[model samples]
Target: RAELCESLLTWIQTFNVDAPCQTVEDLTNGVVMAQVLQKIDPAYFDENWLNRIKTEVGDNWRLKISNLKKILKGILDYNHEILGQQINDFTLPDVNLIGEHSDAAELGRMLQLILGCAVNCEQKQEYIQAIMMMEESVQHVVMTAIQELM
Candidate 1:
């Protein structure tokens, strides 16, 4: 259980790019799949695993959310000149492309989930509660995104 949580936390902090609950659908689906597999095979359940995942690692997770949103707002307001010649539109041609990493908008959505979860948690553990909220938000977004993809 300890090892499992550690691994999941590492993944959430490292591979967990700031994305929307929509864009990161694949990752959330993976978590749900893991849970289902564990249910099917009870010997693998780890209660403390999520605690490690809830732990925060400084600015990487939280800040990524804020930064991603800023970028999204920026691109949304970007003029066509910023995109250079040939493209005549004042904004990005394909907003859906924001779902891709190149646009980084998905990252923003992921971050928002993290931020909201952090703010809404009911646990009294103030120090870590925010972190847990962010973790929950990120996971929720990832899962939801996966569903949308399907």
Candidate 2:
């Protein structure tokens, strides 16, 4: 996971754009970064955190999380297995287009992963707590994507 993130950081550093927003392939770059995120932490991008939200959240949590999981699977699976169907717009949704590009859904997917990591253990919980807050690190990528896309 760390290796993938580091690879993406290196790839970004190699970009020749003085200002990324001006680049011709700006949207491609944005989607690529999002894909990097999907790979860097599949467990989370793949609904690990949503599982938490589902298990702990309220009555409607199941329905909400089920939808979330469905959408998430589409996004992650597309990027992972599909050749070129991944989402690529940085535009925020509006009145006419709530999910025009699903920025919030995309961000929400990332946000769900934005939790302090807890490696599961049989009888102990300390191992999980000891891990550095990972969700923040993932958020950094999302922030960077917006910065670059703009």
Candidate 3:
């Protein structure tokens, strides 16, 4: 788990996002981050510190920065397996789309991957928009036909 979190920190550094958490208030206020962390370790959800951090928003309550870092690191640690599985599930197309002339057959095969990704992840709209964003007009038409058929 420590290794996973260490790698997550490396990945997070790629983006210019703000600090994960600064204080008790930061941890409490960053509910989205909290949710992701909770998904990593079930035990964390039951922690008294976490419970209080979320529920007791009184101005008097305070939490040390180290505590926040610990929780965030745990979450990052758990993300490793989850992300690995998701990446593994992805299947690249057998037919490449980089051909000089756009072919509907190749475009159609490409759509399978795009659609598979979005649909498998419960992001139908995202898949459709991605398909529609194809570079060639034939690719667009193929996607439109696919939309109508489905």
Candidate 4:
């Protein structure tokens, strides 16, 4: 368990874009990290491990929640263009030649990750509960975007 957590932290930190959780992609990546942590040592069932991680790394984790939400807001406000040049039928007109990675379904997957992070980060914080609240504001936007996708 000790080594696994260490490995998980190392792997997740690699998802970081060098400095910190500075972008929507980075933050959504964080959701994946949080999900991993939750799966390996759930807070409900493994309080000892969870608390230890919370006590040890909670500060870092808490920081990213805000950072994630900040960029998430930008991503929604900017539309998926926040990532720049979201694939359109014109961009890849040959639907037969298009790839799954360029599809809106991929964006939907990303939104799911972002949503998971938004929901999961709620109770994860003790003092900074605003992250949870802030995430709520973006839900309609996320869901709407997901539905609007081609």
Candidate 5:
């Protein structure tokens, strides 16, 4: 989980989103993710929509959910209009499951899907390397845990 968070933060930074995504909690509002989507494809994601999202979403669950909805819409639009394929696996989580008390695993899965879209469009080698490193870290942790259990 730690590796996943670190790798995601590093990948997001590569795009220069400029958001202080210092921790997984910082990504809860979806502003950084929206900016990343726009950075990945400027023509598809309008600047006006990006500009409307509030950077300071303190204790505003509605605001956070709204921002997440916009990002999901952007991803859906990109899939249909640009990728020319429907993403059957993608589904929005419950509004209550997001924001302040967001489940880290679920949020991580959501971020992974968004990042996957970016990877498909950009085809950046560096992102792939980061993912590989994350995978290795996860594998190592699992292996160590199993050994300790044994």
Candidate 6:
């Protein structure tokens, strides 16, 4: 579990989010996660919603949970509309456990799922680009063949 947490933290850092996400506790409020999502798909996860989240939650449980709920809804919409995937794989955390108490295990699982989906989205895009390039190359080869035959 420690290794898994470390790897996910590393992945999150790649985005260079404004807030540091060094530990699972740091992920409780979902502020850094929102930033990570924005990096993945800015069009779907707009900055307007992100700005609403308070950067310094302190002891404000209501503010923390609200930020988390917004991020959860954003992920749900992104999965369905952008990834074309059902919500079965993505488990929404119990809103109660996340705010003041902070359930590291459940939150870690959720982050893992989100990372998997993001990686899948990126791979699909690269695959489409590769296919397009291949088609263009094939068209060029066919044109050259026709010219040589003529």
TM-score between model 3 and native: 0.25
Candidate that scores best on lDDT: 6
Where's the lowest-lDDT run of ten residues in candidate 3?
93-102
**Which residue pairs in candidate 6 collide?**
none
Candidate 3 lDDT, tens digit per residue, 58-114? Answer: 332233223333444433343343333232223432222212222334323333332
Clashing pairs in 4: none
Model 2 lDDT per residue over 1-150, tens place: 324333333333332323342221221213333333334445544445323323222334334434444444444454446324334323321211112232333432232232111122121143333233345566899999999999
Off by over 4 Å in 1: 1-95, 124-150
Candidate scoring better on lDDT of 3 and 6: 6
- Compared with the true structure, what per-residue lDDT tens digits does model 6 show for residues 1-150? 446666667666655788878887788788888888877777767778678767888878788888887777777777777785543563566645767677665676667766755756755474346435656877999999999999
Model 1, span 47-102: residue lDDT tens: 44222232232324343333333333433322222222221223322223332332
User: Scored by Cα lDDT, where does model 2 land?
Assistant: 0.35
Which pairs, if any, clash in model 2? 114-135
Report, for every candidate in turn, its global Cα lDDT versus the true structure: 0.34, 0.35, 0.36, 0.35, 0.70, 0.71
lDDT, candidate 5, at 111: 69
Worst 10 residues of 4 by lDDT: 92-101
lDDT of 5 at 112: 68
lDDT of candidate 4 over 1-150, digit per residue (tens): 224333323333433323353232332323443434344224431434223222122335444444334333433432343323331222211111112112333323333433334333433343135434445757988999999994
Summarize candidate 5's per-residue lDDT along 1-150 as a digit string, tens digits: 446656666666656677777776777798888888776677777688688677789879778877777777777778777874344445654434566475555566566667767666654465567667777877999999999999
TM-score of each: 0.23, 0.21, 0.25, 0.21, 0.69, 0.70
